């Protein structure tokens, strides 16, 4: 009945087409200015001095750059992790040369998915249900915090963060594995077992549902037309798909509780991407991966190479050739 409560009951109303709740008062204007700067600086941004060595990199669609090469380039390394908005520049094109578009996208995108994560809580409150889909979105939000914010916090400049582009992510991965050895890190090792394991259990659980459907349908028409939406009964025998997979491996290697099965779908990729997002952030403070270089020695003391040395000859070759004229001293950030 108040002049504010009539506004306060519109924001927290579930009658809208998209939910526009109190976390959506922050993520709608921040993502829309992380979209409007990303779309413009992918098409028509000028070349950006990323390294602070006065050699600009041209990553927008006007300057060549088919879309598996274009990127919103990160900031200048002379700027560093200094706060660089538009009003702290002498002009708007001087702001574009130092790569000001990268912190304007990535501080609004990170603040937008942090309030997407609260908005994913918020509709699970107004609809009256269990609220932990915000916890499952905390694995991509941390992983988008690890490559974009925490790796620029630990490693100095904002130029070490991931470029907003497709070929920039492949450049970010080769430079990372040169200096941090992420492939032999035991927490990235868990994350690819939650990425392959999560891709296994999607192809495993999604198979055993669709292979044990009860036929509420004809022969020639599509199978999906037999599940009327909002029905009460289950559309597949859980007891037959359990008796399938209890014959495949053995009887007690399979969940005939479908709630403990579906929790195991929400636990294996989400904990794995939680451990990847830690690993990139602990390698941001240079707690690197395992280093078994030159470990195997014979009785005379001659070095016998193992399989971690042939990784290292790759790791050294992408170490001397990344940042090919940005180094003046023999050790990399030591």
């Amino acid at each position: 009945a108040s002049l504010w409560e009539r506004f306060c009951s519109w924001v927290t109303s579930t009658e809208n087409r998209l939910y526009i709740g109190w976390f959506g008062v922050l993520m709608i204007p921040t993502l829309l200015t992380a979209t409007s700067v990303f779309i413009i600086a992918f098409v028509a941004a000028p070349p950006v001095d990323i390294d602070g060595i006065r050699e600009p990199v041209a990553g927008s669609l006007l300057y060549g750059n088919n879309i598996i090469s274009g990127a919103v380039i990160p900031s200048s390394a002379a700027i560093g992790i200094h706060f660089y908005p538009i009003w702290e520049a002498a002009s708007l094109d001087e702001w574009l040369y130092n790569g000001g578009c990268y912190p304007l996208i990535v501080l609004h995108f990170l603040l937008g998915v942090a309030c997407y994560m609260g908005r994913e809580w918020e509709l699970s409150y107004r609809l009256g249900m269990r609220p932990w889909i915000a916890v499952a979105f905390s694995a991509p939000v941390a992983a988008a915090t690890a490559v974009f914010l925490i790796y620029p916090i630990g490693q100095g400049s904002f130029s070490d963060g991931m470029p907003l582009g497709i070929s920039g992510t492949f450049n970010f991965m080769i430079v990372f594995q040169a200096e941090h050895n992420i492939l032999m890190h035991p927490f990235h090792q868990l994350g690819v077992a939650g990425v392959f394991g999560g891709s296994l259990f999607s192809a495993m659980h999604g198979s055993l549902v669709t292979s044990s459907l009860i036929r509420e349908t004809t022969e020639n028409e599509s199978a999906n037309y037999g599940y009327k939406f909002g029905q009460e009964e289950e559309t597949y025998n859980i007891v037959a798909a359990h008796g399938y997979f209890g014959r495949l491996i053995f009887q007690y290697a399979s969940f005939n509780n479908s709630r403990s099965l579906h929790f195991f779908l929400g636990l294996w990729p989400v904990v794995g991407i939680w451990l990847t997002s830690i690993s990139v952030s602990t390698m941001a403070f240079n707690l690197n991966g395992f280093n078994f270089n030159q470990s195997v020695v014979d009785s005379q003391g001659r070095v016998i190479n193992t399989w971690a040395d042939i990784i290292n000859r790759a790791n050294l070759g992408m170490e001397v050739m990344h940042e090919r004229n940005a180094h003046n001293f023999p050790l990399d950030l030591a």
């Binding site: 602070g52 060595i53 006065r54 050699e55 390394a77 002379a78 700027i79 560093g80 992790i81 200094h82 100095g156 400049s157 130029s159 040169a178 200096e179 941090h180 050895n181 890190h185 035991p186 403070f285 240079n286 707690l287 690197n288 991966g289 395992f290 280093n291 078994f292 270089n293 030159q294 470990s295 070095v303 290292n312 790791n315 050294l316 170490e319 940042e323 004229n325 940005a326 180094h327 003046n328 001293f329 050790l331 990399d332 950030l333 030591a334």
Partner: protein
């Protein structure tokens, strides 16, 4: 390496570094005299072994040239080699170093 090439007789300013910028001594974006190279991102460092060489406008080019007392070369050569860069099995290096030291900071 500002010390070592000055001890080989270089004018350590007017370095003419490889990209055209300063190799040893450089200019900060706010206009201070800072160290050049990749270490220009860490230009806002206040450290007690170099702050006796900073004047009001950054690093003084006269105090660097003369009063560069050898306890600072002790602390620079120690802190360069004792960098926070390690491994999970405690190997000190730039992640491509052979193992002969157990040091993570």
């Amino acid at each position: 390496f500002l010390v070592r090439d000055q001890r080989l007789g270089a004018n350590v300013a007017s370095a003419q570094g490889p990209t055209g910028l300063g190799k040893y001594l450089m200019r900060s974006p706010s206009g201070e005299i800072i160290f050049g190279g990749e270490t220009m991102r860490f230009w806002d460092l206040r450290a007690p072994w170099l702050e006796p060489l900073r004047g009001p406008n950054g690093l003084d080019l006269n105090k660097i040239k003369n009063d560069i007392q050898p306890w600072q070369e002790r602390r620079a050569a120690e802190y360069m080699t004792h960098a926070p860069l390690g491994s999970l099995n405690s190997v000190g290096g730039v992640a491509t170093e052979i193992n002969s030291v157990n040091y993570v900071s």
